[PDB]
Amino acid sequence: MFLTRSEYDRGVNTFSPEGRLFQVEYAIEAIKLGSTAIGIQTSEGVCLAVEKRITSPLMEPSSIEKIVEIDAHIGCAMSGLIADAKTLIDKARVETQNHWFTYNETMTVESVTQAVSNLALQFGEEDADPGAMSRPFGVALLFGGVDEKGPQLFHMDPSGTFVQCDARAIGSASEGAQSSLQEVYHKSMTLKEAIKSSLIILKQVMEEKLNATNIELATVQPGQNFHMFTKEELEEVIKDI
Amino acid sequence: FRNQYDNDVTVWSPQGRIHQIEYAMEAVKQGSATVGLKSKTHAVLVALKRAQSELAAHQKKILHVDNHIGISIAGLTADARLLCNFMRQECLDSRFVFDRPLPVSRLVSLIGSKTQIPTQRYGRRPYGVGLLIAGYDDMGPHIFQTCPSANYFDCRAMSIGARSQSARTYLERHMSEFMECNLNELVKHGLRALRETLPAEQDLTTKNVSIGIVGKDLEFTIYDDDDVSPFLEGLEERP
Amino acid sequence: AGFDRHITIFSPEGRLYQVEYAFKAINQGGLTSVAVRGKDCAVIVTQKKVPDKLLDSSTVTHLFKITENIGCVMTGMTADSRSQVQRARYEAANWKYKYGYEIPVDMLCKRIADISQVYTQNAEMRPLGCCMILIGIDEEQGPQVYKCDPAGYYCGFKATAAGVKQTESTSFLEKKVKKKFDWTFEQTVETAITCLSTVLSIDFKPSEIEVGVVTVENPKFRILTEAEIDAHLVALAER
């Protein structure tokens, strides 16, 4: 007994029976195609990690940029469509600098996440502007930064909803990686332990054996700014594991 | 079949029903429950928050529009955020222009117009979110609900969201005492009402409850996880 | 097929079936109107049917005054008729403003008809499902009778009918013009009333019909009173 009519999934701005709005749900399914990314929030800081998924050896590893810097205080890790990710990263950067210009201060991670979320919401097309993509943004972002409230990790999804999360995983193996996060995570863990645990989980989920090339790792601590672990630092930690 | 007449808001059905609007009204049922009730001196909003996972924080279900108005949402958070921005700008405009707090009834009228425009035109979908609006003005405490259909109501009490009929029947049988209640009694009544909606295994906690109070002397304040513990402690247990 | 259901697309025989359906929309009303010209007068008659007693008989009318010296009778959808009447009044006043003299009946008909053409060529809007018949006196040409239809055809006529009994009525009128001797005002009105009454079988009373006239002596369009209509009706029965 199979009923597969759907007939309402096509076209945003259509509420299907039971009012589910399936285009956005399919966009939320889309990030599972992306590489797994992982974030852990700790008192010492917030760390972000992602698997690069290098297709060929000739491709330059540095060019793959799945962790980026919105500003010194906030960094982002993304999984999903690289292009619309670039769009949202641009929105985040310009909004941070606009806040600096207007108020001579640094945005909070929640405010930056809300700023990008407002842009993500515009798929509904309530605004009359032509230059807004009709489709929802097929990307999920992890916003990690140290603010007045300390280390904070925010998750953003294609819907534009956002929440703080002590630890979250996005991408293909988010299911199962989140269970591993739930068992390992305790609020007291230091950033060293968080880095090690996140790399353990990434090693588990990743098809290829983990190496300094195929992962990208970053941390923002209260004293420091956003920092990316270099080849040597990545070598040290992946050796320590 | 009748798969036709369901595609768009602009198509009437052979029995005078716009099915897309009803499908939007189904959206409020999806969200976590919310309850609102008022006394002669106060208006209260209480909510059941949901979390994607244990590690994730609970979502924000109560939002402050102004000192004298605040809302709680059931249905799409996107539409909720958009409508909240519109309401906030309307209240700011009223304060700038007339230097008076906007009447809550007039604000819900504006919400109704803005929400109605999508339903009639091709293009933008109906706002698939249901809001409970609670505020104090010179006339007194007020509670309104707005449907994804632009129709709005004025209520002694109301509950929206999943499994809200249980809260509605509790509220109806206990409604008479609400009017003369203290704010503590009133928030306790609302907490029990939303407790009706919860699964039997689940129980009210500091985490999953948010409370929103406004009154003659009290501006709209959302009492968060730590701050709900004074109000929650009074409640006895599940029946 | 699918060649219907949009006005723009042509049939494989190039017929534009949608406008032809708009022509049927006129007959759906169940009312008939007749217009006949005379040597010194032009008249319009149409059925007046009040479905309910409660309806104010004064308000219901298909005879409208586009300007002081032009009158029309609309047959079809009441709302589309009223809209076209408003557009005609605007066109007449705008003509007077721009060109300094009263619009000719033929030019008014031409303007309304070419508007109907822009309707039948652009996609989104539909042809107005109504038919207009204009009567006025032109100093050069004497009395005039003209008809617009949903297609944009605007031809002038000696006499015409519109509605459900159009074919019967034009068959009747065709015989009468063929035995042409003249038409004075009384004979003009009598011909109109006899045509309508014969084709419908009604054997009218004064309430059931509304008549409007123009005459070279009194150029202004006037809608005759029930007493005048009964005066004409009794004269018909007596002879």
Add this chain to the structure above:
Amino acid sequence: RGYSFSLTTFSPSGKLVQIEYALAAVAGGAPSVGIKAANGVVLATEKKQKSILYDERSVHKVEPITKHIGLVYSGMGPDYRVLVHRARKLAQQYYLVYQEPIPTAQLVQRVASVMQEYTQSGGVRPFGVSLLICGWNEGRPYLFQSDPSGAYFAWKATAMGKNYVNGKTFLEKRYNEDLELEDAIHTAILTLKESFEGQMTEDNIEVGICNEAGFRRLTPTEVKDYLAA
């Protein structure tokens, strides 16, 4: 299939079939005949009326765009009037710019450009009418046809409407370039006489001529005199 309904869709085998359907709409229109004589050009068409009640003087199928240009149509009456107004306006714009009467070739180019302008957009339908545009410029006669497609051609003589193929064969049999317009009007009424299915009279036909004087619609008495033969 889908090619049938859309106007901006080339069908397989590369046919814009809605335009062909508009040409079919033209073919259903009443007969019209055009013959270019040496000293003039005659435009003729049947003005057959449904009933005696119709007043022939009210509307004309043959219209002057300018003093020296006039045209006739076969197809949709409303579309004819849209473009006749636009043609008159284009000619007056030419006169404002250049202070010379517009050439017939230029006018047919402009109205054909308009007709092409309509075909491209999906929101609009093509004009379901074709025209025979006749003119006298530079001491020479002209006859042109402009189709719904937005294309135009120059004909010595041609026919549109019902039985246009048979009328064209009758014309090419009867046509001589040396004809004067006095004979050409006779040939034109004969070409229409092929296809009436009725007893033609002064009212049932409308005919006009162009020459060094300019375009004119010869009166019912004139066409009666020519019909008497």
Add this chain to the structure above:
Amino acid sequence: MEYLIGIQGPDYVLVASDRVAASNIVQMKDDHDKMFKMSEKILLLCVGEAGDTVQFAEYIQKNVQLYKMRNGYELSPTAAANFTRRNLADCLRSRTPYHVNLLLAGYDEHEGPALYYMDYLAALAKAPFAAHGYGAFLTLSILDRYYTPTISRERAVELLRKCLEELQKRFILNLPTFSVRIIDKNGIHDLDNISFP
């Protein structure tokens, strides 16, 4: 206030300009370059109201180089002159007139050397020799005196030196150093700066 001079010849065009950019009275820059190479064999010299000079020169330069990249061959000097004239003339009616006075010098393989002159009102004129600025009033008579259509390039640099030392003798403003360069079939060639200490 700024001096431009151009001398056409049989197979060359010589161009020179003062190297001073100035505030009210202070001569902020002693080595300002008023010569912009639109292409390999064409130069644009520009003087006028500040800002407008560099903006217009850069705009025309980038448009000409875009022409080069798109079409694979350089614009003719005459075509570049007509193009910049069109751009200047269109702006004259507009609310943002570029108050600029230009001298365009070029070499075409087919049409040989060319020198073009245009004022802020955007008139265009080909000329054998021309100058812009207040110094032009002093120095044009030198050229009109000693110029020959068959002048050799050594004679041309000598004539230019005479023209400039006249400015040194008589012109009120201080234009101590001038830049010099020649266009020929080979292309733009820098020459030693004519510097009067």
Add this chain to the structure above:
Amino acid sequence: RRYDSRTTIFSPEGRLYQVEYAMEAIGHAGTCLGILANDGVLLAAERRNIHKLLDEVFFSEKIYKLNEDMACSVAGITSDANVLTNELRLIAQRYLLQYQEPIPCEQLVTALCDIKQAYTQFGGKRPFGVSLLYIGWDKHYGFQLYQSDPSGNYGGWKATCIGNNSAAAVSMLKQDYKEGEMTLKSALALAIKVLNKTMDVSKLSAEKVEIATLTRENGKTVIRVLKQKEVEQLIKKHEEEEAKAEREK
């Protein structure tokens, strides 16, 4: 099922079928031909309209002059052809206004091809169902022949044919055309030969073809249409030569 509609959907295997369907349309058109020679370049076309009661009032039905220094012949929908030729003339005169030099041939072709590409890409408008040959002389590259298609893609050809029997025309031209050895007379003879081969009519009527030649005389381009007597002489010469070749065997 159907990935051939709206001209904006890449079908699986990544093909735009609307433009291909438009390219199908030009094949129905009357054959047009262009040959490049050392001294000149010519355009020859078959006047597909051979109705008895048609007047040759115009300069040419197929051949259009776009500028002093170039011309074009068109195969495809006549209305889109008229639009494209008007746009071409405006583009050329805009370049002349801006730079005060004649438009380069390749630049004009490239501009119109950009228009034609644009109509493909955006949703509402159909692709131009036209293919047209350009002939011109420019100072940079001398005499040039260019072809364009509905896709907006152009190329430079020594000789080419568009329209009905274009494959047969190209096959005949491949063997016959002598690179670097043609003169305008020989190219005219070749044009008559390939037209006679392609055109279904046994005898080229000399009212069923229109030939135009572009040559530089006295430093100024001249675009001339060979008159009926000239093309009559050409077909007579070709018939005589072909019969003599027949007579020998």
Add this chain to the structure above:
Amino acid sequence: TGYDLSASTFSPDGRVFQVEYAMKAVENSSTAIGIRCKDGVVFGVEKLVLSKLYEEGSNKRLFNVDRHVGMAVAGLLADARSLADIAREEASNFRSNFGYNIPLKHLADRVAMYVHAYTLYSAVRPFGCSFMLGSYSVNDGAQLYMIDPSGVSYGYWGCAIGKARQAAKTEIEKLQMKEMTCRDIVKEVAKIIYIVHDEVKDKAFELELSWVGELTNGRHEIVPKDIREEAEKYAKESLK
């Protein structure tokens, strides 16, 4: 049959079925009636109480579209509130430009044309509301007008809209409103509404009444509660 999908379309037999489908919308609504008498116009609405939770004096179906005119609606309440905003805008614009209170016939015509705009175009649906308008002015007199979703407008001596239109219309027909006065007409309106109300299908209703007339000095206003209670008691007594 794809003819009924859009309002731009016509049926092959000359019927625009979307408009009729919208006319079926109002029949879902609870009844509302308006009666015109010599002194003025009285309006009444049967406002069903869906829940005890809902406040009284909420979900008002009687609106004041200007000081001298009132509006009673049946059909979609959202569309009705929007139409009321449109009518208020039209009345305000009329006052601003022409300097006096809008005539009711003209106001009905303008809002009717605004409604009729929507039946034509494909992008936008017909309104789902049918509403009555009523005013009293010493010059014009008592006037009652009803506008359907189509944009048809007419003047009614008595009118009914909604679910129980036909029964309400016969009850109104046996009334002789022309001679009567408003303070009796309120009682008879209450009687008719109580009659047509179906106790089995509809659990309960709160009678919502308004009038305009000379007794108000030509201002539409909600009934004083004493008069409401008197009329309701009379209606319950007559019901038996």
Add this chain to the structure above:
Amino acid sequence: SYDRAITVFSPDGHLFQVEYAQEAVKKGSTAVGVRGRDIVVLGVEKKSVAKLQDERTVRKICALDDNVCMAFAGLTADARIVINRARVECQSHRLTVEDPVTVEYITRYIASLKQRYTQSNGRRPFGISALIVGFDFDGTPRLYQTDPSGTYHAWKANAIGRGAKSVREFLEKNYTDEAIETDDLTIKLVIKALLEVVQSGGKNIELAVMRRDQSLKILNPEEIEKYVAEIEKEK
């Protein structure tokens, strides 16, 4: 079902029209790029002369500016539009910031344009992928690739178009620091790679080089003949 509009996501969140455009790229002629230590070489196959066609009109390799060039595989008209737009952006960037464009800047702009056409329905994606080569201010060689989707990636060496899979497998095998040591070795590597997938060697490859501070040079057919002869002899 879900393949008719660019905007609509599929179940499992696949946008399929952009995939179809990426497939359209595969139809096109091959192109190859390799980064030498001091050279960047860009090689493109030539379909056929046809014997009545002028080769100059058809050129896959093009110079956006003095320091940047691209080659494309995909729809030729779309490539022409994108090339012109990138050229005007190059000159506009020089106008705005008084500095020459960086290779990553121009590939970002081209990618943003392609992305802009993907996001909105009523516009089709540019059916091209490009190989952009240039030397930055530091003088490091840069090679980037773009696709209809709008993602861009640096590559040490890459190919696009038909036979890209085969030639890139060959290049993954062959490429090393040793091969990049010599400019002639870089040119020979790309020539051998194109020889891996092409009907004939000299006739059907059009190749170009950019040096550290020199303009683009399209190698003469005689030079390409000499290089293939050297490659052929060594075997």
